[PDB]
Design a protein around this ligand. Sequence first.
Ligand code: HEM
Ligand code: HEM
Ligand SMILES: Cc1cc(N)nc2cc(-c3ccc(OC(C)C)c(CN)c3)ccc12
Ligand SMILES: Cc1cc(N)nc2cc(-c3ccc(OC(C)C)c(CN)c3)ccc12
Ligand SMILES: Cc1cc(N)nc2cc(-c3ccc(OC(C)C)c(CN)c3)ccc12
Ligand SMILES: C[C@H](O)[C@H](O)[C@H]1CNc2nc(N)[nH]c(=O)c2N1
Ligand SMILES: [Cl-]
Ligand SMILES: [Cl-]
Ligand SMILES: [Gd]
Ligand SMILES: [Gd]
Ligand SMILES: [Zn+2]
Lengths: 401, 402
Amino acid sequence: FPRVKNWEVGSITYDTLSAQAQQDGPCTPRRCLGSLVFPAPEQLLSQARDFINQYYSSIKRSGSQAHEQRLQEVEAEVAATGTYQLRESELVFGAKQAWRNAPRCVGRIQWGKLQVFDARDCRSAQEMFTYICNHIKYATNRGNLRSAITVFPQRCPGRGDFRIWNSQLVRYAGYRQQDGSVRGDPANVEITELCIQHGWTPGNGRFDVLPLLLQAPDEPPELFLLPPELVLEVPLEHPTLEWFAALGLRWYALPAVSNMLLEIGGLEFPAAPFSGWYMSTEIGTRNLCDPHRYNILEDVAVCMDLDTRTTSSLWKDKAAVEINVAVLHSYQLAKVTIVDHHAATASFMKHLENEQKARGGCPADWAWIVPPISGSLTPVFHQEMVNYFLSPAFRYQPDPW
Amino acid sequence: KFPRVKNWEVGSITYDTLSAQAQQDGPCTPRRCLGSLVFPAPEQLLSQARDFINQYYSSIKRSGSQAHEQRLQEVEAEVAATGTYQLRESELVFGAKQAWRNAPRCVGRIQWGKLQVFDARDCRSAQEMFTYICNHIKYATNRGNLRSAITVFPQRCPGRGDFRIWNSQLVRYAGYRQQDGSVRGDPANVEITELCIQHGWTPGNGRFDVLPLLLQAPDEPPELFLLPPELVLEVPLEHPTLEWFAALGLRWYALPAVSNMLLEIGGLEFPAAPFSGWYMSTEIGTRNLCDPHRYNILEDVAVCMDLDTRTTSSLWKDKAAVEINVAVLHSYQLAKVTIVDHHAATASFMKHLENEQKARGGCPADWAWIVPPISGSLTPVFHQEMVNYFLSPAFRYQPDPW
Ligand code: HEM
Ligand code: HEM
Ligand SMILES: Cc1cc(N)nc2cc(-c3ccc(OC(C)C)c(CN)c3)ccc12
Ligand SMILES: Cc1cc(N)nc2cc(-c3ccc(OC(C)C)c(CN)c3)ccc12
Ligand SMILES: Cc1cc(N)nc2cc(-c3ccc(OC(C)C)c(CN)c3)ccc12
Ligand SMILES: C[C@H](O)[C@H](O)[C@H]1CNc2nc(N)[nH]c(=O)c2N1
Ligand SMILES: [Cl-]
Ligand SMILES: [Cl-]
Ligand SMILES: [Gd]
Ligand SMILES: [Gd]
Ligand SMILES: [Zn+2]
């Protein structure tokens, strides 16, 4: 039982929940790979028995009652048909628990408040597209953002999968030219290539909202242009640097990830887009300052009249800080839910303590919980953490080409 | 089947084949990662001795030599007669450099080849020990143009106690606990400050009182030694535009000289081998000055900057922290004391990684420690995957002697 210390307060705790991790991670006694970004159907049933067993413990009702009853229904269902279906409340419970188990997610204090949209009755691309549009609309809620997941039909043995091709529902275009240089977001250059290749008309410049590429079983994907009024955007302005607005920067309101596989009780949902709200360093630091994303840091520094000649003026640090001030300020002015990295990390500490009392620990990936700016100014920096895999879980999955 | 490490900023891929040589075992298992933990006979003394000799003779492109095989037989014959063996002077110089080269949390390893190695294996008393240390400090400081050095005191041997330096660094500021339950000076050094006083040191009452050295000879109580004031170079901290900053009375010392780690070379152990380089400015500005459990000046800085303390979303902590680091860099450059900022440091560490991959097929690096504690993703090391493992020779932590 790993002894875990907080070096700011001197507290000690023991992670007993780690003793129930299963699906092996990438590390060995010889070497740690914790910094890596990507590390006979009989086993379907054993994964079902354990998932159901914590469901009934979670509602006290383990032993007696329909706890016993529900074990046979799945026993018999897999025996006849190979797969099984989850009850609606189980699917709600599995969604929340996989969020609760995401080691790299700093917003998990919120894991109990999740709206689950059951789309297992789906059978078309246009049927997915309307389901996605209800998600975005409900989740955006005019800027008072609400966590949401939409779950599409579970993969069946034989016959294909539902699968969104965009990494997120809202992503900006990436265009090349002669120079190999990119106009727009370089992270989304390939998916933009696959959008033109499927009959999309390209666009003006930096911030062209990509059309969705949705793929029902077998028959290939089809474009679906997003309606401009439901893709909510925030134009970036700075509270005191008057010239910042004229840089024409924007970002969208809703981070909505659409390329991960949800696993509950042994079933795989390759299309199950979830969404919440942004922590501001994701926008200001990673999306806009990363050298391989929009890469704006130098431009903001020239406007601030900073000494770009020598690294020891910390012009990069001054300019990054003001970009984040502009992100927070613009989202608030537009009344869109956003959280700063200090508030978010302070809440995650609170979640660590709750999770101690409840389950005896919490899988947490230190490199991803610590913010990408001002790391040691946040309480999670000085907090040792244990990373391991629990189920239910969100998992990465190969892209479909 | 060697780990594939990717650089995400540019798209590089290499495989760490050096990790397959990791002749120790860390705290991670397939079932859980413990990478963020701060703290993770003759037959085997022989196998480590043989491995180090093999290394040394490969580095002088003399592997498999008669001189190589002779040296193996000599060490095997010496652990037979005495249970231990002695390093040659050149093997000791090589081994200290390798230990620096192999330290996974050190971002300054680009410099690993330029290390001045003082052999103090003939040291006999705490008094001589003080003399070797003073000369280490004088050489390393070099009037502000700082040089990398290590002094090696006698190895651990059976039938005699260890040379130990009780202080964690050669230069540290006292920390006096108060009636408020508070601490004047550096809170991290409250323990050593009590130890010094209970071994007969007259305390001060400032926030930057340099602590005496507690120096333990074999089988002796620790002996207290006060450093000549003119040996400890100090940098008063001022800000290039914020003039009230100078009136905080902040200072820091020039020379980071770690003195409580164990140096291990081919199975031999050197529990007293203090080493020193130069500071990266974030160690001073972000950690030593802004950590809540250290000097904790951040709120006081931000209040004076007229920032909005009542809410986190003003990013008052980030802004105050960046100006404290500006003050550190400017103060050290004003005083002509060597210093490196985290952008220069991480850029050169990337060159180190490239140099190391060509030479040994990899490099042990601890991502959570290589990434600076501010502005992480503004540096190239943030986007570089790394593999953490333990190669030997090596610096290791060891328990406090008390
Ligand atoms: C409501 C506020 C939320 C915030 C502030 C938040 C924040 C974050 C952040 C900052 C990351 C790091 C990714 C990166 O920086 O590249 C992350 C990853 C992640 N988040 Fe959250 N998130 C929120 C809601 C949710 C919801 C509703 C879910 C699932 C239903 C979720 C699941 C995940 C997953 C699965 C990952 C990556 C998984 C992993 O690698 O462990 N988050 N989140
Ligand atoms: C010349 C300039 C040097 C710089 C800029 C530098 C930088 C650093 C930094 C920033 C740390 C971590 C501090 C922290 O985490 O708060 C570190 C750790 C360390 N450094 Fe260096 N260092 C230098 C020289 C040296 C030398 C000369 C040696 C030994 C001969 C050395 C050996 C180590 C070791 C053993 C650690 C701890 C590593 C571990 O625990 O795995 N460094 N260094
Ligand atoms: C619900 C949610 C809210 C939020 N506020 N943020 C989120 C960030 C990610 C996420 C996951 C992986 C990932 O990276 C993969 C390429 C490994 C990235 C960007 N790197 C973001 C996923 C979900 C998020
Ligand atoms: C030669 C040198 C130069 C420098 N510029 N910096 C250095 C920092 C450390 C060091 C080592 C460990 C450590 O922490 C514990 C694991 C003991 C800390 C503070 N976190 C600093 C050690 C040596 C350093
Ligand atoms: C998770 C983490 C990352 C990092 N990058 N650094 C860290 C440094 C410390 C830490 C805390 C106290 C401490 O020292 C006590 C003996 C006062 C030392 C060593 N001096 C290190 C603890 C955790 C750290
Ligand atoms: C190499 C390194 O592991 C990689 O760049 C990681 C580091 N930590 C991260 N943390 C978050 N939240 N998001 C990221 O994309 C990354 N990138
Ligand atoms: Cl994003
Ligand atoms: Cl220090
Ligand atoms: Gd101007
Ligand atoms: Gd001024
Ligand atoms: Zn690990």
